[PDB]
Amino acid sequence: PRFLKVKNWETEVVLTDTLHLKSTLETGCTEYICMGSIMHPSATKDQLFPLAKEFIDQYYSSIKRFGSKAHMERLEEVNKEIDTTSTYQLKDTELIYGAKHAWRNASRCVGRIQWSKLQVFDARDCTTAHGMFNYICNHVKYATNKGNLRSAITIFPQRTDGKHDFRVWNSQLIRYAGYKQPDGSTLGDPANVQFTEICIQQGWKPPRGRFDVLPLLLQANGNDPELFQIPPELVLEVPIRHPKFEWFKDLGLKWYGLPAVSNMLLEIGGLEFSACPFSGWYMGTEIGVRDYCDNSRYNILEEVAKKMNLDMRKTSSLWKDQALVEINIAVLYSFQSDKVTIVDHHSATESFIKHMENEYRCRGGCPADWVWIVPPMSGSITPVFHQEMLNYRLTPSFEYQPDPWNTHVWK
Amino acid sequence: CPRFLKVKNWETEVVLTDTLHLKSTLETGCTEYICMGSIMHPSRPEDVATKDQLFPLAKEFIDQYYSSIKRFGSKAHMERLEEVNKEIDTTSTYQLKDTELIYGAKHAWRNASRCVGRIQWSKLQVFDARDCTTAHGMFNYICNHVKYATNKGNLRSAITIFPQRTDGKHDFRVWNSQLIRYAGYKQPDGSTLGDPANVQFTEICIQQGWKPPRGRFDVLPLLLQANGNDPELFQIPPELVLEVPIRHPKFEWFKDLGLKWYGLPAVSNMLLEIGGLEFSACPFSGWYMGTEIGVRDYCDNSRYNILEEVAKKMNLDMRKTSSLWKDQALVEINIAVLYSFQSDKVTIVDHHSATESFIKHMENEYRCRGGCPADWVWIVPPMSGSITPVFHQEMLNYRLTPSFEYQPDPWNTHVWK
Numbered sequence: 020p021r022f023l024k025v026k027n028w029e030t031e032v033v034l035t036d037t038l039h040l041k042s043t044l045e046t047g048c049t050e051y052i053c054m055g056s057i058m059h060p061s062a063t064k065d066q067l068f069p070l071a072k073e074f075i076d077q078y079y080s081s082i083k084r085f086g087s088k089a090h091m092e093r094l095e096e097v098n099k100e101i102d103t104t105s106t107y108q109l110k111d112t113e114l115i116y117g118a119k120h121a122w123r124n125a126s127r128c129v130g131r132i133q134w135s136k137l138q139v140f141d142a143r144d145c146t147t148a149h150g151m152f153n154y155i156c157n158h159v160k161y162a163t164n165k166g167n168l169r170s171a172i173t174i175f176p177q178r179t180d181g182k183h184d185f186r187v188w189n190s191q192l193i194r195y196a197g198y199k200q201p202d203g204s205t206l207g208d209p210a211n212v213q214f215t216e217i218c219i220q221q222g223w224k225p226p227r228g229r230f231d232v233l234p235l236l237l238q239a240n241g242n243d244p245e246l247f248q249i250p251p252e253l254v255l256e257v258p259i260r261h262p263k264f265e266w267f268k269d270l271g272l273k274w275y276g277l278p279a280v281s282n283m284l285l286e287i288g289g290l291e292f293s294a295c296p297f298s299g300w301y302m303g304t305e306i307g308v309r310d311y312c313d314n315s316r317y318n319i320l321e322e323v324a325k326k327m328n329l330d331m332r333k334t335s336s337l338w339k340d341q342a343l344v345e346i347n348i349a350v351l352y353s354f355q356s357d358k359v360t361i362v363d364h365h366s367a368t369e370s371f372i373k374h375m376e377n378e379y380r381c382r383g384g385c386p387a388d389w390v391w392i393v394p395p396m397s398g399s400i401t402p403v404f405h406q407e408m409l410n411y412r413l414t415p416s417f418e419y420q421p422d423p424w425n426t427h428v429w430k
Numbered sequence: 431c432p433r434f435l436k437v438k439n440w441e442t443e444v445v446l447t448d449t450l451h452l453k454s455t456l457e458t459g460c461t462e463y464i465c466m467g468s469i470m471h472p473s474r475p476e477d478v479a480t481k482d483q484l485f486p487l488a489k490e491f492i493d494q495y496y497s498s499i500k501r502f503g504s505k506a507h508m509e510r511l512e513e514v515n516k517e518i519d520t521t522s523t524y525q526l527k528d529t530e531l532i533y534g535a536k537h538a539w540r541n542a543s544r545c546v547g548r549i550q551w552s553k554l555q556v557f558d559a560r561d562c563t564t565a566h567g568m569f570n571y572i573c574n575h576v577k578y579a580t581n582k583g584n585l586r587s588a589i590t591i592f593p594q595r596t597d598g599k600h601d602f603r604v605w606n607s608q609l610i611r612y613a614g615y616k617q618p619d620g621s622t623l624g625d626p627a628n629v630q631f632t633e634i635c636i637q638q639g640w641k642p643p644r645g646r647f648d649v650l651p652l653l654l655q656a657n658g659n660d661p662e663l664f665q666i667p668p669e670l671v672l673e674v675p676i677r678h679p680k681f682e683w684f685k686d687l688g689l690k691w692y693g694l695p696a697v698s699n700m701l702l703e704i705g706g707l708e709f710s711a712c713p714f715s716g717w718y719m720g721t722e723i724g725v726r727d728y729c730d731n732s733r734y735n736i737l738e739e740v741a742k743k744m745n746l747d748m749r750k751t752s753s754l755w756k757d758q759a760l761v762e763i764n765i766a767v768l769y770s771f772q773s774d775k776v777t778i779v780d781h782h783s784a785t786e787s788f789i790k791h792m793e794n795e796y797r798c799r800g801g802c803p804a805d806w807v808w809i810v811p812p813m814s815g816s817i818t819p820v821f822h823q824e825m826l827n828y829r830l831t832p833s834f835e836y837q838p839d840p841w842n843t844h845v846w847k
């Protein structure tokens with residue numbers, strides 16, 4: 020256990036990490052094998068209180084009332100409540116604190132300079148899929164804000180016995196359908212082929228277009244999930260056009276403005292919130308590099324490069340790289356022209372470096388996953404490429420969880 | 431402690447199974463509670479390996495060698511072991527056979543987790559220079575290496591291995607970080623002429639007596655240390671230094687930037703570790719991936735930094751980042767680099783071809799060897815990461831021996847005569 024230095028090899032700034040000593044969860048690495056590029060490496064009454072205590076301790080530390088009378092009483096209150104009921108309920112203040120710090124601790128998120136501006140919607144009183152739909156509609160409307168996007172999270176009731184889980188079966192609140200074609204190719208988003216088929220199996224009548232917004236598939240209290248249509252006036256979309264290539268609009272592309280991830284698990288003080296959709300705004304490469312140009316995604320690189328009359332016979336002409344830049348120029352230009360919040364990867368990584376300085380100064384460190392922070396294009400011409408980073412696991416945290424259709428027992 | 435580890439390719443869904451990690455030797459710097467995968471170097475000169483330290487390291491290497499030639503447990507294996515054990519017992523070190531030197535050099539490359547070019551690992555020309563005694567002799571060896579590896583533009587990978595460390599006060603060192611590098615000169619007004627990466631080494635050469643041309647692309651002299659003596663300066667014969675003028679297939683004006691680069695990347699400041707023996711002077715060379723020149727050598731802010739001037743000549747809007755003018759310029763610079771090498775028939779590989787080859791290599795190594803240590807942070811190219819197949823490939827990073835290692839710069843440790 021020592022202070023660890025991280026160096027920026029471009030600015031020669033050296034930061035000293037003390038926060039990693041507070042980490043208690045594991046990373047997946049060992050002294051002998053590093054698993055930094057593995058995507059997914061690796062409760063009862065008895066285990067719950069220490070986890071609760073650790074979180075309550077840090078909550079009262081954060082508000083400069085550690086050891087105070089209310090700190091004492093809250094610990095005695097949580098211990099007694101776990102005794103009698105095998106669980107406990109978070110105060111509203113603790114819920115907000117926990118949610119913001121889960122975002123603050125998300126080592127893979129380049130957007131964390133914004134972490135303390137998070138609108139937290141408490142939905143722990145929800146009991147049915149219809150109520151989930153209401154809460155989700157309100158979240159989408161608030162977060163969208165006519166294009167002036169606002170970060171938000173909506174937190175549904177925590178897991179109890181594991182048989183009554185609340186789940187949003189969608190991976191994002193807003194995504195486009197994908198259809199397995201007769202010949203074998205894909206109409207729409209190939210990332211959502213399985214989920215789309217589930218919705219059709221569940222009664223959804225698919226328009227079978229290239230940009231069909233998917234219905235919500237919502238599971239309350241462990242019951243069978245139910246389908247809902249997001250009111251279309253709440254779904255903000257940007258048609259993608261290019262500022263110089265007049266033909267780009269003829270590609271017929273568009274995307275949605277609100278990135279709202281809804282399949283992750285929020286963990287606070289030992290409690291597990293299996294339904295907790297959270298939303299911010301996009302970095303342009305999320306759409307223009309990954310969602311449009313991945314092999315198993317929309318894969319428009321070939322067509323764009325053709326329209327640019329590029330030499331596509333050899334890889335060394337870098338025709339993919341040229342078309343990739345133009346696609347990302349069009350995405351940024353399109354969102355900005357419609358006044359929908361978006362950030363480019365130069366600005367976002369610049370902000371993250373500034374964020375890192377803040378966290379080392381006030382918190383003693385910032386867990387960061389270089390593999391995920393560095394953008395998927397033009398990596399070394401962003402400031403994070405040359406920034407050393409220490410990755411470690413703090414709680415409260417967002418965690419992965421299995422897709423519900425693998426675990427659910429239909430009634 | 432499970433015996434098998436799985437890695438997944440999230441683009442193709444191929445799953446590979448790693449058992450080779452069981453043979454990892456030294457620490458990564460990571461723990462179960464922290465990952466140091468993005469730290470550049472996560473893990474006294476006279477402090478050399480002792481007898482009791484050297485015995486197991488030699489045995490492990492000899493065993494691995496005789497296993498690779500399908501002679502494990504043979505009479506030759508046992509006799510080699512006994513011979514090595516008696517050398518260490520009576521001389522505190524031992525000498526590798528030529529076969530073992532060659533095997534060990536090829537395998538340090540095969541084990542280099544940060545190298546994307548390892549599909550070529552078994553095609554490495556090994557030059558045994560362990561009979562060298564003086565810096566003039568090192569210069570002779572290095573000149574021959576350069577000429578052989580350059581091969582009039584049809585580049586061939588090669589390593590030259592000088593005598594191993596003994597007591598730590600008689601080290602052979604190449605003080606250059608690469609055999610061919612351009613000088614950098616800091617001006618009184620703070621600006622830099624030439625290559626900013628090499629200002630410190632350039633200043634050392636000048637102090638040692640080098641008369642610098644004070645140009646933009648001045649090939650640096652070799653600064654060579656034999657047997658722990660003070661290092662000596664030599665000029666590489668310019669006819670041995672193959673260079674490529676950088677021009678662009680569509681932009682007439684690109685040649686007017688006056689850019690060029692050298693054909694042969696030849697890293698000369700690393701240490702080669704084989705069976706506990708330490709080869710502190712072991713320059714090795716291959717051929718370039720274009721982005722090593724076009725992204726890092728030209729566009730890094732602390733390097734040649736020509737993004738601005740290119741973007742101006744392209745008449746891009748440079749007043750806001752969201753126009754991606756930097757991204758546009760970077761692609762064209764890398765187009766020019768590849769077109770220039772190809773037009774001059776100098777071997778080079780683009781980052782699409784290189785990463786596709788590495789994936790095929792990595793799958794073959796999992797199949798035949800049981801794994802392939804790979805450092806994602808270094809394997810993924812510095813531009814267009816996610817449109818190359820390595821971006822979506824999970825990797826396991828661990829340290830196998832024989833290995834290439836970092837070592838301290840020699841001017842920080844050398845005891846001047």
Ligand code: HEM
Nearest residue numbers: 122125127128129130133170172297298299300301302417
């Ligand atoms: C406000 C603007 C935000 C921006 C620009 C942003 C940007 C990003 C990006 C680019 C990624 C990588 C995405 C990918 O590669 O597909 C990411 C990951 C992530 N973000 Fe943020 N984000 C923002 C807000 C938020 C918010 C509000 C939360 C939660 C309250 C959050 C939590 C996360 C998590 C949990 C991950 C991934 C961690 C994992 O998969 O293990 N982000 N973010």
Ligand code: HEM
Nearest residue numbers: 539542544545546547550587588714715716717718719834
């Ligand atoms: C044959 C063509 C080769 C290609 C295309 C190639 C490519 C590369 C690249 C692109 C890197 C990362 C460089 C950077 O980002 O600065 C690298 C690193 C490396 N390569 Fe290769 N390489 C080749 C040959 C070789 C040979 C012949 C050897 C040794 C015999 C070697 C050993 C290494 C090592 C030790 C490293 C980096 C390890 C470190 O710095 O920690 N490579 N290579």
Ligand SMILES: Cc1cc(N)nc2cc(-c3ccc(OCC4CCC4)c(CN)c3)ccc12
Nearest residue numbers: 278279280282283297298299300301302305
């Ligand atoms: C709030 C927010 C804003 C934003 N601008 N971007 C965001 C991106 C993610 C995100 C990215 C990748 C992920 O991993 C899944 C990969 C396998 C296929 C993609 C996950 C985990 N669901 C989340 C999560 C939240 C984001």
Ligand SMILES: Cc1cc(N)nc2cc(-c3ccc(OCC4CCC4)c(CN)c3)ccc12
Nearest residue numbers: 695696697699700714715716717718719722
């Ligand atoms: C045979 C070969 C061919 C090739 N095409 N490329 C090669 C690149 C390296 C290499 C790259 C980066 C390195 O580290 C540099 C960091 C310190 C500052 C940045 C080192 C370590 N000297 C070696 C080594 C050998 C190479």
Ligand SMILES: C[C@H](O)[C@H](O)[C@H]1CNc2nc(N)[nH]c(=O)c2N1
Nearest residue numbers: 056057058390391821822823824
């Ligand atoms: C295999 C690799 O770890 C995986 O593809 C990761 C790499 N880095 C990433 N980085 C971001 N931001 N998003 C991703 O989906 C990924 N994928």
Ligand SMILES: C[C@H](O)[C@H](O)[C@H]1CNc2nc(N)[nH]c(=O)c2N1
Nearest residue numbers: 404405406407468469807808809
């Ligand atoms: C901070 C970071 O680890 C460092 O800048 C690394 C990142 N990855 C790299 N990858 C390669 N191939 N070469 C490099 O020089 C670097 N630099």
Ligand SMILES: [Zn+2]
Nearest residue numbers: 048053460465
């Ligand atoms: Zn690690």
